[PDB]
A paper describes a structure:
PCNA is a ring-shaped homotrimeric complex that encircles DNA to act as a sliding clamp, ensuring processivity of DNA polymerases. It also operates as a platform for recruitment of numerous other proteins involved in DNA replication, DNA damage repair, mismatch repair, and chromatin structure and assembly. PCNA levels on DNA are regulated by loading and unloading. After completion of each Okazaki fragment, the Elg1 RFC-like complex (Elg1-RLC), which comprises the Elg1 subunit associated with the Rfc2–5 subunits, functions to unload PCNA from the lagging strand.
We then constructed strains expressing each PCNA mutant as the only copy of the POL30 gene, expressed from its endogenous locus, and found two PCNA mutants PCNA-D17K and PCNA-D21K that accumulate on DNA even with Elg1 present. Retention-prone mutants PCNA-D17K and PCNA-D21K have point mutations on the DNA-interacting region of inner ring. Elg1 can physically interact with PCNA-D17K and actually shows enhanced interaction with PCNA-D21K, suggesting that accumulation of those PCNA mutants on DNA is not due to a loss of interaction with the Elg1-RLC unloader. These retention-prone mutants increase the mutation rate even in the presence of Elg1 (columns 3 and 5), suggesting that PCNA accumulation on DNA alone and/or the D17K and D21K mutations themselves can increase the mutation rate. The structures (at 2.80- and 2.85-Å resolution for PCNA-D21K and PCNA-D17K, respectively) reveal that the mutations alter the inner pore of the PCNA ring. In both cases, the PCNA pore becomes more electropositive due to the swap of a negative charge to a positive charge. For D17K, lysine 17 is positioned within the major groove of DNA, where the electrostatic interaction with DNA is also enhanced. The D17K mutation on the other hand disrupts a salt bridge network within the PCNA pore, resulting in partial unraveling of helix 1, and a conformational change of an adjacent loop (residues 20 through 25). Because this conformational change occurs on the primary interaction face of PCNA, the D17K variant could potentially perturb binding of PCNA partner proteins. To avoid this complication, we focused our further analyses primarily on the D21K variant.
Author numbering:
A (entry chain A), B (entry chain A), C (entry chain A): 1 to 256
The structure:
């Protein structure tokens, strides 16, 4: 059996929002220590990887590992079905016919129990994170979201440039162009709005704006975003859950 | 002559919202004791029936009965034309060339008088309400609306099931499935949120979700909804106005 | 060189909203005393004319006159790129390769500098305002916007009628019809909501509702709108900036 109770369905709803642009069929491996999931998109330039730990739940029990594969169109539909504050419970049995999602409320009324038929997906799991990235940075999710959104209207390609104490976002398209230059600093009032940067090697990479627009949906889950860039491997954008994470690996646009 | 003044145009606007999915041509019989109207839809599975009494108005005068038939596309358009708090007045003369809608405001400015050309509709009025329905229930309009809306995303058919002290809404479609089980109780704090049920015979009927989605638009007009279900006749969903009602008769889906 | 700093980008964003329905290519003449611009639409029935004076800015410097022509689709896109309270600065050099738009914020972070490639437009400037219009009136932008919007749903033509102390807006189409009659008065509490009218000659003109809908977008820029109507020339609708204006000249519909 398996029973995992989120204190608030909002968290799972936002996490699943994080997958709008992958293969709508996604495997969720549920183990003794929590849930992991990963999904690639069609073009195979973007990988989404989620880990939710035991303590991110309100309650959690997984007697034996169980892989449940779900259609994210349909799970996303079923996840519109309650107030963000409802306690959401995933329930399954040893070999799962189907996953159960049970919503509960502040009031003692209205049991809302949904089911989702599980699919059979072949699990080709990707371990593509690097040890040392060329540069690491972190900044408020809100700020990163605004930068991406704004620059997205000028061209279909956003270019990240890292030099000593200088982070430069640039969109250069037919109509016009735009640049946003931020620099590291500590804001002692709220260490939230702080901007951190470690640069082992300067970097200059270009990304499809469609995919950055997808990636910034994770702002709903964390105050800060972490960006690891290197010229060799795909770039990593990470939003941290209370004991967990949602990660977006994105391959830079090719030059030719 | 005929002159009927709603204290607030909001009420008539919401009532007319209740007709979005009928023959856009609708007869309004205005009599000494108020207004009645009824409209069937194309497929002829849903009937909408409205009664507004003298006391639901701010003022009312109908010297002689007058039938005024209107295009609800066009009346709906003309009903976007003022603040919800404007005093709205319907005006007509003995044999009506046209209906007049006169908006007035808190401020003494801005007379806004619209007209609508009347059509000739043949009045085939339906008296299809039963004496004894198999089961009767009542519950908050908000709750019924949420249940219908949620379950509507899983299949195109919602199934109502009534057993002793148990009301069960169920949608079972291709992607997944959903169930919502409520039970009767008295909430003394707010007798609003109370859920009432009388069951003379258990019932099990299925309804097109398109039509339940249409029917729940009446939540704007009442705190509670009444549902009379029987296996013989069409089901009745009723929202009560201050001395009036808006009723939706809906024929269950056929089994075959 | 040229450097013009709006205290708040909101103002320029709303001004440019005022041009949604012109030739998307628009000349901006920048002179010692401020900025002027004008744009005709395709059908050539509507002219939009803007003047912004030195004092409407937070800072202003124009060493030599410079004509910069811009695509308003693209400038409108680039103008979504900041908070309404950002200080927006237009920057150019003697013969302009490109215009620069520099956003600055309350916080010392995030330099956001965009560029727009300039086009070559031939400047056929129109001086079509009359000395004496047949009638002049002024009324709250909100009220004019509501009247236009409401009446726009009944027909594609709105008809203005001016008689002694009587202003009458009328839409008369297939579905129904609507009339709105306002009269001059002084409201001493707020001289804003006052309605002023000088009538040298009664007037009766008809206007495409598409174009009135376009014109009312200027409500964002002023509390009041001024309307000069005459039977000879195109009608003038004027919204006043703090030392400036946005004007819409609109030719009446032809009778035939």
């Amino acid at each position: 059996m398996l029973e995992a109770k989120f204190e608030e369905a909002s968290l799972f709803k936002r996490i699943i929002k994080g997958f709008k642009d992958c293969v709508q069929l996604v495997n969720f491996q549920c183990k003794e220590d929590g849930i992991i999931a990963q999904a690639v998109d069609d073009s195979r330039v973007l990988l989404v990887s989620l880990e939710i730990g035991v303590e991110a739940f309100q309650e959690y029990r997984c007697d034996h590992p169980v892989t449940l594969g779900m259609d994210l169109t349909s799970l996303s539909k079923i996840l519109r079905c309650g107030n963000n504050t409802d306690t959401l419970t995933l329930i399954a049995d040893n070999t799962p016919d189907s996953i159960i999602l049970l919503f509960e409320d502040t009031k003692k009324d209205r049991i809302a129990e949904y089911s989702l038929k599980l699919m059979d997906i072949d699990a080709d799991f990707l371990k593509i994170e690097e040890l040392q990235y060329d540069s690491t940075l972190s900044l408020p999710s809100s700020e990163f979201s605004k930068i991406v959104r704004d620059l997205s209207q000028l061209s279909d390609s956003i270019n990240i440039m890292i030099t000593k104490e200088t982070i430069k976002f640039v969109a250069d398209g037919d109509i016009g162009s735009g640049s946003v230059i931020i620099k590291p600093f500590v804001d002692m009032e709220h260490p939230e709005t702080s901007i951190k940067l470690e640069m082992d090697q300067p970097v200059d990479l270009t990304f499809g704006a469609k995919y950055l627009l997808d990636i910034i949906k994770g702002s709903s889950l964390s105050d800060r975003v972490g960006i690891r860039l290197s010229s060799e491997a795909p770039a990593l954008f990470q939003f941290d859950l209370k004991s967990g994470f949602l990660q977006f690996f994105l391959a830079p646009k090719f030059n030719d």
